[PDB]
Amino acid sequence: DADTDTAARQRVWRAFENPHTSTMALVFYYVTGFFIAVSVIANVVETVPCGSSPGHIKERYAVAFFCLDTACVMIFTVEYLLRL
Amino acid sequence: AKGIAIALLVILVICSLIVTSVILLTPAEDNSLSQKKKVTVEDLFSEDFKI
């Protein structure tokens, strides 16, 4: 009956940890979830032979995926840093 | 809600375009050299093959 009640720079924290309060918190929440999803999809489609295997030694092996994780990782850091 | 979805669309198109630029700039080589030229009848009868 009396667990919690909804009650500055720290204020967005309540918005941040309750993303269904403000538009900016909700959009950041959804987009970082999308980033987690796209990073794991990048990993799995890296593992497939068509992407990162010598399927055609004669000729593809994209090293562009080596960027996709890093950016995503850095993105995640900021919200962690936000929680710092 | 749906305006927040528009905000998602804007942020995702920005990030997608910037990472597309990143993956366009990173492959500095983006090129390779294939096999050389084989020998045909014209090559035998080409002036270059004259002894």
Side-chain angles (χ1 to χ4, degrees):
Chain A
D1 286 323
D3 283 330
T4 181
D5 183 75
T6 61
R9 197 71 165 165
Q10 298 284 322
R11 183 82 276 169
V12 299
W13 174 255
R14 191 272 305 277
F16 187 76
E17 309 293 340
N18 201 351
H20 282 282
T21 293
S22 72
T23 285
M24 60 159 206
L26 190 60
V27 63
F28 187 43
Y29 184 70
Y30 265 77
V31 71
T32 190
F34 177 89
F35 292 165
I36 299 165
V38 75
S39 177
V40 66
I41 295 169
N43 197 343
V44 54
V45 309
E46 179 272 332
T47 45
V48 67
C50 313
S52 292
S53 84
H56 48 69
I57 302 102
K58 277 74 69 177
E59 305 208 10
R60 59 190 294 266
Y61 180 83
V63 75
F65 312 118
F66 172 73
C67 310
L68 276 162
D69 49 316
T70 71
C72 289
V73 167
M74 293 183 286
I75 300 165
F76 302 146
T77 59
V78 72
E79 55 253 33
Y80 160 63
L81 308 183
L82 189 148
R83 303 166 189 178
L84 284 159
Chain B
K2 190 51 67 70
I4 310 169
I6 302 160
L8 276 296
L9 193 45
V10 172
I11 186 55
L12 71 86
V13 67
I14 296 169
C15 77
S16 161
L17 192 61
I18 195 184
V19 301
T20 302
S21 302
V22 164
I23 70 170
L24 282 159
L25 62 92
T26 178
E29 45 269 19
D30 212 343
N31 291 123
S32 180
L33 197 44
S34 173
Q35 205 177 181
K36 52 160 148 61
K37 179 66 188 99
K38 65 98 175 180
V39 181
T40 196
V41 165
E42 283 100 359
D43 311 334
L44 308 192
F45 287 73
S46 298
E47 174 53 50
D48 309 347
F49 262 64
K50 186 197 275 183
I51 315 293

